[PDB]
Structure formats: C-alpha cells, structure tokens
A paper describes a structure:
Angiogenin (ANG), a 14-kDa basic protein is an angiogenic ribonuclease and member of the bovine pancreatic ribonuclease (RNase A) family (also known as RNase 5). Like RNase A, ANG cleaves preferentially on the 3′ side of pyrimidines and follows a transphosphorylation/hydrolysis mechanism. In addition, the crystal structure of human ANG has revealed that it has an RNase A fold and the catalytic triad (residues H13, K40 and H114) is conserved. The enzymatic activity of ANG is several orders of magnitude lower than that of RNase A towards conventional RNase substrates, but essential for its angiogenic effect.
In the native ANG structure, a hydrogen bond links the Oγ1 atoms of T44 and T806. Thus in native ANG, the T44-T80 hydrogen bond selectively weakens the interaction between T44 and N3 of cytosine. In the T80S ALS variant structure, the position of S80 is well defined in the electron density map and its atoms occupy positions essentially the same as in those of the corresponding atoms in native ANG. In particular, the position of Oγ1 atom of T80 overlaps with the equivalent position of Oγ atom of S80 in the variant structure (more solvent accessible) and retains most of the interactions seen in the wild-type structure. However, a significant number of van der Waals contacts surrounding residue T44 are lost in the variant structure. In addition, the absence of Cγ2 atom in the variant structure meant that most of the van der Waals hydrophobic interactions with I42 are lost as well. It is quite likely that this results in slight reduction in stability, causing the observed loss in catalytic activity (~22%).
Author numbering: 2 to 121
Write the structure that this text describes.
C-alpha cells in the first residue's frame, strides 16, 4: 500500500465526470475533502487508471525535469481554480476542461504527485 497513491487518486482522479462545469468543481472539491482551506487550483484527470499508472513506465511516460514524468498520451482533465478573495468555504471554483499530457511524480511505479504548474 502507498498512501500517497491513494491520496493521489482522491486529489486528482475522477473516472467518469459528465458536465465539467463550475458546479462540478464545487461539488468534487468538497467531496474529496479539499475545501478547508480552499485549494487555489486543483486538476482532476479522467478516464482509466491503467493509463495514468502507465506514465510511471516507458509505456506512457518519459522522464521530465527533476525526477518527474511526462505522459506520452493526452488525457481529459478538469482544472478547478478558486475565485473570490477568501481561502475559506464556501469555495467557488471556475472549471477549465482540457485535453493534454500530464506531469506526475512516481514512486514504486505509482503516481504520487501531480504537477499543477502546467494548468495555471
């Protein structure tokens, strides 16, 4: 077990969204426990998990920068960006759907960190 992998899934994986609008972001950010304080930006990756884990190997990733990995395939993602002045709930979010490759950090063949800089 890797608690950082499980935390990765909680913070950054959502298999099957439908509408990835502002209200999607407000709900899932509350649901995954990311609202006290409001995380300023957070991105969710969609689709299957095997594709995400595959970034940790040659199959679907390349080494990137300082011990990160960058994916070969593009993913459906949604970025939730905090707006308003306050760090505390109610946390209002702007949703930005995207489709591109993702940067992760892996440990023991498992993603444990999502690089958020590429989405801000």
């Amino acid at each position: 077990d890797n608690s950082r992998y499980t935390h990765f899934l909680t913070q950054h994986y959502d298999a099957k969204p439908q509408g990835r609008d502002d209200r999607y972001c407000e709900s899932i950010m509350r649901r995954r426990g990311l609202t006290s304080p409001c995380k300023d930006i957070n991105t969710f990756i969609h689709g299957n998990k095997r594709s995400i884990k595959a970034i940790c190997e040659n199959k679907n990733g390349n080494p990137h920068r300082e011990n990160l990995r960058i994916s070969k395939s593009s993913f459906q993602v949604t970025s939730c960006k905090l707006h308003g002045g306050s760090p505390w709930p109610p946390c209002q979010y702007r949703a930005t759907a995207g489709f591109r490759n993702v940067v992760v950090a892996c440990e023991n063949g498992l993603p444990v960190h999502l690089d958020q800089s590429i989405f801000r």
